Design an enzyme around this catalytic site. Sequence first.
Site, short mmCIF file in Angstrom:
data_model
loop_
_atom_site.label_atom_id
_atom_site.label_comp_id
_atom_site.label_asym_id
_atom_site.label_seq_id
_atom_site.Cartn_x
_atom_site.Cartn_y
_atom_site.Cartn_z
N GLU C 173 1.06 7.89 2.56
CA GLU C 173 -0.14 8.43 2.05
C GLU C 173 -1.35 7.67 2.09
O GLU C 173 -1.93 6.98 1.12
CB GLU C 173 0.17 8.68 0.58
CG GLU C 173 -0.97 9.43 -0.18
CD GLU C 173 -1.09 10.81 0.29
OE1 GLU C 173 -0.27 11.05 0.96
OE2 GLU C 173 -2.39 11.27 0.08
N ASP C 174 -1.59 7.60 3.55
CA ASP C 174 -2.78 6.67 3.89
C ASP C 174 -2.65 5.32 3.94
O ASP C 174 -3.62 4.69 4.35
CB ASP C 174 -4.19 6.84 2.85
CG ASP C 174 -4.26 8.41 3.05
OD1 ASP C 174 -3.80 9.30 3.75
OD2 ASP C 174 -5.24 8.95 2.03
N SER C 175 -1.57 4.83 3.31
CA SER C 175 -1.47 3.35 3.56
C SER C 175 -0.85 3.07 4.78
O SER C 175 -0.09 3.82 5.43
CB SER C 175 -0.51 2.79 2.41
OG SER C 175 -1.34 2.76 1.28
#
Lengths: 115, 38, 481, 52, 47, 258, 51, 51, 51, 66, 18
Positions: C173-175
Amino acid sequence: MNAPPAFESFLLFEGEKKITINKDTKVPNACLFTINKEDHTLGNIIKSQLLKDPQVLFAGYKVPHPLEHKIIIRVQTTPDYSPQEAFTNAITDLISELSLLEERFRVAIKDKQEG
Amino acid sequence: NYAMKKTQLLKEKAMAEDLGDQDKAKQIQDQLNELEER
Amino acid sequence: GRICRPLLIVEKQKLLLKKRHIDQLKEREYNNYSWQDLVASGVVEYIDTLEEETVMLAMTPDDLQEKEVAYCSTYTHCEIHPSMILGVCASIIPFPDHNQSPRNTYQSAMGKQAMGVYITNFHVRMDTLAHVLYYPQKPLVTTRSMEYLRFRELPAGINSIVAIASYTGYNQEDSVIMNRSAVDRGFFRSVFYRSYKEQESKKGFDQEEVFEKPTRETCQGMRHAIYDKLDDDGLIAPGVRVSGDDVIIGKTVTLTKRDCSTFLRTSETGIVDQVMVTLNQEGYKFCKIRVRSVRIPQIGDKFASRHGQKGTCGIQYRQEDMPFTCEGITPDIIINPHAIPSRMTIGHLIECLQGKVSANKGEIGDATPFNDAVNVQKISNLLSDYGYHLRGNEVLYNGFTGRKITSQIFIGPTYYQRLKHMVDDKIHSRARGPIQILNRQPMEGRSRDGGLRFGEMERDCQIAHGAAQFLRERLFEASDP
Amino acid sequence: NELIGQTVRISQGPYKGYIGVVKDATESTARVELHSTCQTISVDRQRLTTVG
Amino acid sequence: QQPMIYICGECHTENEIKSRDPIRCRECGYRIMYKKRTKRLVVFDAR
Amino acid sequence: PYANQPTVRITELTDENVKFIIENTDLAVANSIRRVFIAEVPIIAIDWVQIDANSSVLHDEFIAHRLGLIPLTSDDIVDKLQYSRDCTCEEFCPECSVEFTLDVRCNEDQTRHVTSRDLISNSPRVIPVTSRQDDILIVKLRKGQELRLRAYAKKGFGKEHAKWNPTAGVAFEYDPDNALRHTVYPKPEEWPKSEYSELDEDESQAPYDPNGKPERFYYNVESCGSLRPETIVLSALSGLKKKLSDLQTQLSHEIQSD
Amino acid sequence: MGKRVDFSARTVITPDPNLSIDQVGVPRSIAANMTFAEIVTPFNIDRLQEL
Amino acid sequence: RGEVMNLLMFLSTWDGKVPQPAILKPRPLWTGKQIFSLIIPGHINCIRTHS
Amino acid sequence: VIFNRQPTLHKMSMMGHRVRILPWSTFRLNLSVTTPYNADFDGDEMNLHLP
Amino acid sequence: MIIPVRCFTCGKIVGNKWEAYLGLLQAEYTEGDALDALGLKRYCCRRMLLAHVDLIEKLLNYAPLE
Amino acid sequence: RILPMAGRDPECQRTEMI
RNA sequence: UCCCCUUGGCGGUUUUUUCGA
Ligand SMILES: [Mg+2]
Ligand SMILES: [Zn+2]
Ligand SMILES: [Zn+2]
Ligand SMILES: [Zn+2]
């Protein structure tokens, strides 16, 4: 600021045991071995070596948390052979493989170099 | 040493601020040496 | 104030700009043939938005001068190059026509937060809040237009081996997972400078402010701090390590004497880089002190790609743990595949591939949007020449087991940026810090060592919970009893 | 007290050969801010040596 | 035991500016000066 | 039950890299050896820098870091030096560290190249890889600028910091042709053949091999020049052997305490 | 209705699947500043005294 | 088993007993759904339609 | 600890969690717990309140 | 700014080749040919020199600290 | 027009204001 | 059958701009 110094990934503090033996409650002849200050590098080879044991009913390992420099190896063996002695043997023979490989690579090199 | 600007500024200022053309030439002689001098 | 742009003039369905102009201009390095000659000759013209409504504008003469079935037959101008509609931050983006435009907007914004060498005299300046990357690089895939931003000479980012794979679940999740070993090597490493301005002054007739190593026997207001760190001048010496609340300038104002010194800001922990001393406009002693801070990219530090992929360092794994290709190539950054299908940042994929081709070809790739002469098929053709999968995927071998991962991972050089949002500038904790003297509630903001506001929406959430003892505790027993 | 503000070298443990200024000192440990790194470790005073 | 030596800007020359002495270089009289490196110990791990 | 019998076959041997194949060993063992070359192989690297004087625009930590990344001629030195944290003598000495000196100043008008030749060493056996070809560019200096510093190189390994990683690039591979299908190609005709593929060009990938374990572990261990590439392999086997020996020792303590 | 509160913290979030759904993986510095008032009792006096 | 025993290392509520493999010969093989049945707690009973 | 994200739209925006100390300066949270808080990790911050 | 000492991804030393590379760059060699001459074949290594910007040349323009 | 940066201007201010 | 240590939590604030989810 909160970076643990890299040495904390492998250096044992005072009292920390490199390996910890714990009994499993869910099944007989089963233990959970908790290695401190370790990662997948030492765990997968031992796991694979345990899979070679015909008296190992279950064997696998995990690093409970990657940010934790600690791993959990679970071993489960036959009633006539404890998970502890299985671990003993899985250490006894994995070392043997690496020692013989050291000797064979050393001779293959000395035979390659000036020969 | 960093006074190249000071000498350049001194020579540049003198040329417009001074009514004689000789001052700009005398500064120009120093200015040519300034490339090595800094 | 009239915004205008130059355009090619089109009198017939034929250019005013012939080879003689071009022949003169390729030699522009020697002869200075320029825009003045082009406009003075009446080949180019500046059209303003208000005038652009009565001009018929072609996009390119090489195509809008031929015909199949005449569309217009009355062009008046032709665009010099359509990619010039993009701005400064928007012109570093490779393949911007292959991205969903909102992502482009986010990159355009994120191009403003990327750390980098902002100026060549950065080591001279005693300016506040300066960040410069250790090893920023010229992008491997550039628009031919970023040369004019001089980004080749003043880059902000690194061509990084990006692996688009959800690896070990932390690249989520975007990390993004980052290569710990690369960071050791200074990957995305930057230095951050903060500058402190200080001047002694005439407080009044009875009291005057002066820099001095304060001493208990005469100075009031002294604290437990280490004044020993300032030298007898009363100023910290360059090269001395400082930390939060350390005294930096021993200012003292005479009464016996009151300690009005300046201490390092809350939560800073820096090293004095250089100390400049002078006199201010008023001729009072005045000094600016600059403290440098090396910012190793850690977990939580915010990274963005040139395609609108804002994302935090999710976790950092050593090279032994990062996945590796058939050869010893590990990704520098692992990004989540689920970030792509939702954002449709195909320009990202094309960049990661052209960077791959650029590093293999050994030439800087062109990612100008409306290229028409460089497309994925042509790029694939280029990649297919190097003994690589023409679409760029690779057989990654698990770093943990070495087993090939059943999916061949899309991997390649992509120009990533490190944004200024380091986690250490935001991490905050409190237990009886200062209180606002009016409403006697914890102060606000991390510099004032403030406390988090427990707003009404949070209260209402507790109302719905019916946790009335907690709600009362937070709003009274834990706030201002 | 006495060694606050002194420059000490850590002569033992993982931080052997580290230089830091002391910010606290008890009979057993002192809080050393490292001159190099941006962290402040607490270490035993017998492991510390003073360079000043 | 310092007469309080400072380094000029444009001169790069050590100038002695004692306490309450105006920060000006002995040569060029430029008003900008920088403190000399601390004589205190400076060591880094190179990491 | 017992240990498999590993074998070795050096296919290419240079003073920069070794391409060899290890057989009759587990996939885990082969990947573990791969990991060990990167992380668990000790070497000497600059990890301590006392900058006495620096007038360059580059910061002491910046300077130090770059120096830290310099490969040092450590082939026998690492085997005799004590780990930096472990030495019994106070502070540092040749027995546990390597002292370095770099006092350089630009006096000529042309810019001075602060090369690795300028890195004075207390030992002739430990120097940056500059024996015989250009030098590591450390800094560029203008007229009158100087850099005077004392430094120590510590015995460490890549798991702690990449500086202690002796490798340039390890091209590890097994089952070159995809017989175990451990990876399944969506379109096998789009895939280039392996560097060690001992198979003709007609088929794209080898047919599936159900009962067959992974062997023929192909390597290309390329050194960054600090350590000889064959000693890197010997060091990885000895270092992994060390970890297991240490674990056996600690386990004996954990078991005998009955 | 909204106040600033002691014993409250804020930090940048990151994913972590090894933590339980009802768990928070907090940094060490925050814990080093935030404290909890625990009453001494014969059951815990030994712990708190040495603590 | 070499793979399954790695997956079961991450189940908290697994009782430590390996389920009979969905395919026994020529050599024991477990189906993902078979391993997934160890993840499901107690006796759940539900029916849904896949996407 | 009770954990909240600032756009506190509903009751599940302030669930209580057990603390786990970890290095590296960040509030790590479980993947499934991301959805209730609607808390992506692109640079989000969450507040931890200690009773 | 100045040539990185090592390849970010793989660890090969690339700091000792920039001057060699500049010598090669004086001639009409394409950026790829210099790497070929210097023997850097993996793209991880090639990216290091291809993308480098030698700004230190600009940093030398500033007046020196005698 | 541009004056040649000449004169003590602060003194010019201070003195004429007397 | 001359004395002498005696130091312990200080604090700007408004307004405007920029930036984060
Ligand atoms: Mg977000
Ligand atoms: Zn001067
Ligand atoms: Zn020693
Ligand atoms: Zn490389």
